[PDB]
């Protein structure tokens, strides 16, 4: 299975009430392993997973130092953008940054990313070739010319195809029992009587990892996409995820519906039926 490593950064300006809030988190696939909170007392990068705790002090002092530097960058960016858009110093704005790499099942570099957003909208992003940029608007183009002129893309390329993939591999290795595991979902159905001539059939998939999963309903082998109530995959709080798909079934028709669960943790897809 292919994997990925990603770092997410959120910086929020609090006009008249201190420095902006800066939150940074790192992930390997769907498992968080580090975090940083500018409002936290420690002021250090902290571990959020078992397999990273065994990194020595050098690692923690290094990432803390670099995360603090990231924080400082987003602190200056907020002001730059505030001016690029001629905005009041009273309003609260948000800048987001995301960068990382994906490797194939062969653990080799597949693609790299480095995107940036302002108040929820794309601002600038590195293109797949890792040499050109996608400037959202007019303000974004000023940054693009400056990153072009400074040869920013070239440096990110070195990081995304080198360090990023190398540490991803190291992490995948150090956390084998975790990151390289495949937790099949626990499944079941619930039957609730809507009224007299109908009932809601809900298909459950629980305690599964990674998050990716496909849960669909069928009537006589026909896809019920449009008639399926499908929720957003949520976290259990213990590293596993949960999800459900439901449909309304006319009386005496439970036999016609099948629930199909596709997940990497399954030896073969599952076909559940109320019975």
């Amino acid at each position: 299975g292919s994997h990925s490593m990603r770092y997410f950064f959120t910086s929020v300006s609090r006009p008249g009430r201190g420095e902006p809030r800066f939150i940074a988190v790192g992930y390997v696939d769907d498992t968080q392993f580090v975090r940083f909170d500018s409002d936290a007392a420690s002021q250090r990068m902290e571990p959020r997973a078992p397999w990273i705790e065994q990194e020595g002090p050098e690692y923690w002092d290094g990432e803390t130092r670099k995360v603090k530097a990231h924080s400082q960058t987003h602190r200056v960016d907020l002001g730059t953008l505030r001016g690029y858009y001629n905005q009041s110093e009273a309003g609260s704005h948000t800048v987001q940054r995301m960068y990382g790499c994906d490797v194939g099942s062969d653990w080799r570099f597949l693609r790299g990313y480095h995107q940036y957003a302002y108040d929820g909208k794309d601002y600038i992003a590195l293109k797949e070739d890792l040499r050109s940029w996608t400037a959202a608007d007019m303000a974004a183009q000023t940054t693009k010319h400056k990153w072009e002129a400074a040869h920013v893309a070239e440096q990110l390329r070195a990081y995304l195809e080198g360090t990023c993939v190398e540490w991803l591999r190291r992490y995948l290795e150090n956390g084998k029992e975790t990151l390289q595991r495949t937790d099949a979902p626990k499944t079941h159905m619930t039957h609730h009587a809507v009224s007299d001539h109908e009932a809601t059939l809900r298909c459950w998939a629980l305690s599964f990892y990674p998050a990716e999963i496909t849960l669909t309903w069928q009537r006589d082998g026909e896809d019920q996409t449009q008639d399926t109530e499908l929720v957003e995959t949520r976290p259990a709080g213990d590293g596993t995820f949960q999800k459900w798909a439901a449909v309304v079934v006319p009386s005496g028709q439970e036999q016609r519906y099948t629930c199909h669960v596709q997940h990497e943790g399954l030896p073969k897809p599952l076909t559940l039926r109320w019975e």
Binding site: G26, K66, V76, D77, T80, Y99, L156, T163
Partner: peptide, 9 residues
């Protein structure tokens, strides 16, 4: 690990 270079806009 983090990228060692975080240029500013």
């Amino acid at each position: 690990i983090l990228s060692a270079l975080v240029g500013i806009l």
